[PDB]
Design a binder for this molecule. Sequence first.
Ligand code: 77U
Length: 249
Amino acid sequence: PIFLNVLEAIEPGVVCAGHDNNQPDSFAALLSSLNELGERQLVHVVKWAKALPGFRNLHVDDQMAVIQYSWMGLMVFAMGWRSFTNVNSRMLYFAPDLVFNEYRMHKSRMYSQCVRMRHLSQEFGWLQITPQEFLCMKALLLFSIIPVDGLKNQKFFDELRMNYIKELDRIIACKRKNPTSCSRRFYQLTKLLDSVQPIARELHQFTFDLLIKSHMVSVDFPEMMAEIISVQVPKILSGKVKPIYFHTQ
Ligand SMILES: Cc1c(N2CC[C@H](O)[C@@H]2C)ccc(C#N)c1Cl
């Protein structure tokens, strides 16, 4: 079980936000803490990505790009898992010290986005996603969004993507002696992965708008954070960079 060995070995651990839970909730405090958390999550995703099997076959610039474009979706995906495993998807488990009840969902002004994120979280339970299915799915999320004009070396990317699809296909939980079982299972997981992208887009839009008006609402954006949001995210929001869907929408 070599592939799965790697994924579990490299799976990040706990990442705290730094948030002061003894102060009364407020938009600026909430979003500042999420942004700091995004910065911290980003560092970890970078190290995780680079330790992935076959990832360094990618050209150097494609590596950072692929990381930057997928960063939100990957965060959202793993955050839903934490929420699923730690609170049965009742609240959003961004970090041990940053857990969103309904009131923070409202005070963050992200209620519509949070609702979608919680739905994804509930899907892990509804589908009974195994932890092994989660790891391969998350690995695959990293290779699910590219420039329409293509990467610097697309061949190596397509090869990686193909192989991560195959690894996901090997490990799906199904009665192998029944073809219909595994077909259905695969369909569902492909559908679930597809459902991360619209959510990532809504978040992309929110953070982008938030960044533009940050100097009025008093929200802090960390350095790597703001680089990504001002340079990479608009390529997504403008159609230059699109998600690879399994199923046509
Ligand atoms: C959506 C999101 C984060 N967003 C929410 C909006 C904010 O601009 C920030 C980038 C931050 C951290 C995690 C985690 N973990 C997640 Cl899932």
